[model samples]
Target: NPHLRAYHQKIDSNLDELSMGLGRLKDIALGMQTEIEEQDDILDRLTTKVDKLDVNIKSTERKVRQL
Candidate 1:
């Protein structure tokens, strides 16, 4: 009976550590997800600005050629 009790105690300790580690991992994952979304939004806005710049450059080049 005593041996079985000791075994259970060790198993319980391991389970507690495992649960805490998983909780930490979950927190880190959520933070990463939020950061990725913010970067994605910034990149999308940057792409739109660059596209406008491209159009303006092309128009300027055409005007220069005509002159």
Candidate 2:
């Protein structure tokens, strides 16, 4: 019974560390979500730029045909 009490005492001390680790994991998840949103925004901007470039290229081709 005495040895079992010691094991329980050790587990009690580690409760704080377990709480801290869980908090840190939550922060990591939030950071990951923010990064993914930023990447998606960049992708949207690039797609818009490519669409504009496509329109410009077609306009240029029409002008060259006239010349």
Candidate 3:
């Protein structure tokens, strides 16, 4: 009855706080997607570098074996 009215008021305040928290989480998710794209671009460049190194390694091995 009237004794539980304070508890109900507390819940109402928490509901607004929960909504704000959800909105902040949505903003964080969007920022994360952009960061992922940036990282993918860096990974492509690193892979290209590794391919070039592999070619050099094979060439060096062939030259040493011939000697």
What RMSD, rounded to one decimal, does every model reach? 1.7, 2.0, 1.9
- Taken over the whole model, the C-alpha lDDT of each candidate is 0.99, 0.97, 0.97
- Model 2 weakest 10-residue run by lDDT: 8-17
Model 3, 21: alpha-carbon shift in Å? 0.1
Query: All candidates' TM-scores?
Result: 0.78, 0.73, 0.76
Return the candidate ranking by TM-score, descending: 1, 3, 2
* Cα lDDT for residue 22, candidate 2: 96
- Give the worst 10-residue stretch by lDDT in candidate 3: 1-10
Candidate 3, residues 17-42, lDDT tens digits: the string is: 99999999999999999999999999
Best candidate, lDDT-wise? 1
> Model 2, 1-67: lDDT tens per residue?
9999999988987997899999999999999999999999999999999999999999999999998
Q: Which stretches of candidate 2 lie over 4 Å from their true place?
A: 65-67
lDDT of 2 at 58: 100
Off by over 4 Å in 3: 1-4
lDDT of the structure predicted as candidate 3: 0.97
